[PDB]
């Protein structure tokens, strides 16, 4: 290009579609762009290139009802990072209620025991947007009062949830899944945001959700990603990490995907994603 090499360099271009975030608002794709850019800019020296086949990075329902994009960058041999994953999912089928999901998860390996990172924006309905924003814990918080103190007390993580909840439009979200409730830290922002007034929703996303998410990511990068872990704790951590991932993707990959993308697309991608997700 005149101003650069995005449309020339293959790596940059493989994520161009991912970063397009076609099916969401300006404010929503802007948050996600900024978040994914920080992740990759900040961790570029320890992240392997995306090796997902083009076939798995972008896929769709041939009937045009559903479209997804996935961007995964594994950590290098010496990284505390296992992998980071950006995703978006679009499904507009039934009477016309279009499901939209944008998310970024960061997952640490055994060599550290520090918290993971998660943001998810999910709009299935039209009266509601769900925000999941957390640094989920990788150690039992009652057995380890010190872990709780340095990752959740010292870090003022709960200020972000208390802040967002003050808004009249923002109620607590309660997962029907007990695993979800257990897997997320006591400072997790699990929130429902009223969605039926685009101009106000947009204002809440840009003035409130965005600073909050950027600051949470800021502590993940600064206090979690930036003593050794012994072999007994390593196996504990790996058993725990594998449950959390499996359980987090299983029903979606196995039940939701064949519906959304037809069977042919599911059969092509589902295994490859479980592969990529270590499960």
Q: In what order do the strands lie in the sheet with 58-60?
A: 58-60, 66-74, 81-92, 98-108, 117-123, 128-134, 189-194, 170-172
Q: Is 263 a known ligand-binding residue?
A: no
Contact between 170 and Na ion by CB under 5 A: the answer reads yes
Q: Is 173 a known ligand-binding residue?
A: yes
Contact between 182 and a copy of itself by CB under 8 A: the answer reads yes
Size, binding site for a copy of itself by CB under 8 A? 25
Contact between 247 and a copy of itself by CB under 8 A: the answer reads yes
Binding partner of residue 229 among Na ion, a copy of itself, none, CB cut-off 5 to 8 Å per kind: none
Binding partner of residue 227 among a copy of itself, Na ion, none, CB cut-off 5 to 8 Å per kind: none
Contact between 133 and Na ion by CB under 5 A: the answer reads no
Binding partner of residue 170 among a copy of itself, Na ion, none, CB cut-off 5 to 8 Å per kind: Na ion
Contact between 236 and a copy of itself by CB under 8 A: the answer reads yes
Contact between 3 and a copy of itself by CB under 8 A: the answer reads no
User: Is the Cβ of residue 174 or residue 255 nearer to a copy of itself in the bound state?
Assistant: 174
Contact between 119 and Na ion by CB under 5 A: the answer reads no
Binding site for a copy of itself (CB under 8 A): 140-143, 145, 148, 152-153, 158, 172, 174, 178-179, 181-183, 185-187, 236, 239-240, 243-244, 247
Binding site for Na ion (CB under 5 A): 165, 170
Q: Which residues are annotated as a binding site?
A: 120, 173-175, 252
């Amino acid at each position: 290009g005149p101003l650069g090499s995005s449309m020339e360099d293959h790596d940059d271009h493989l994520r161009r579609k991912f970063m397009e975030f076609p099916y969401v608002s300006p404010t929503r794709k802007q948050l996600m762009v900024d978040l994914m850019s920080t992740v990759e800019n900040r961790l570029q020296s320890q992240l392997l290139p995306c090796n997902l086949p083009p076939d798995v990075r972008n896929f769709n329902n041939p009937n045009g009802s559903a479209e997804a994009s996935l961007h995964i960058r594994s950590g290098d041999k010496s990284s505390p990072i296992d992998f980071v994953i950006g995703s978006w999912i679009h499904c507009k089928i039934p009477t016309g209620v279009s499901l939209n999901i944008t998310s970024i998860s960061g997952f640490l390996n055994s060599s550290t025991k520090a918290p993971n990172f998660v943001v998810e924006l999910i709009q299935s309905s039209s009266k509601s947007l769900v925000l999941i924003l957390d640094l989920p814990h990788r150690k039992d918080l009652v057995l380890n009062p010190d872990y709780l103190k340095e990752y959740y007390q010292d870090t003022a993580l709960d200020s972000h949830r208390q802040s967002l909840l003050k808004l009249p439009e923002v109620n607590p979200y309660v997962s029907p899944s007990l695993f979800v409730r257990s897997a997320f830290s006591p400072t997790a922002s699990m929130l429902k945001i009223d969605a039926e007034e685009e101009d106000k929703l947009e204002e809440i996303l840009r003035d409130h959700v965005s600073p909050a998410a950027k600051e949470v990511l800021e502590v993940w990068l600064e206090r979690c990603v930036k003593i050794v872990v012994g072999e007994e704790e390593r196996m504990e951590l790996e058993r725990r990490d594998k449950s959390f991932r499996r359980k987090s993707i299983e029903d979606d990959l196995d039940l939701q995907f064949p519906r959304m993308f037809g069977e042919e697309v599911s059969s092509r991608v589902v295994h490859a994603i479980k592969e990529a997700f270590g499960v």
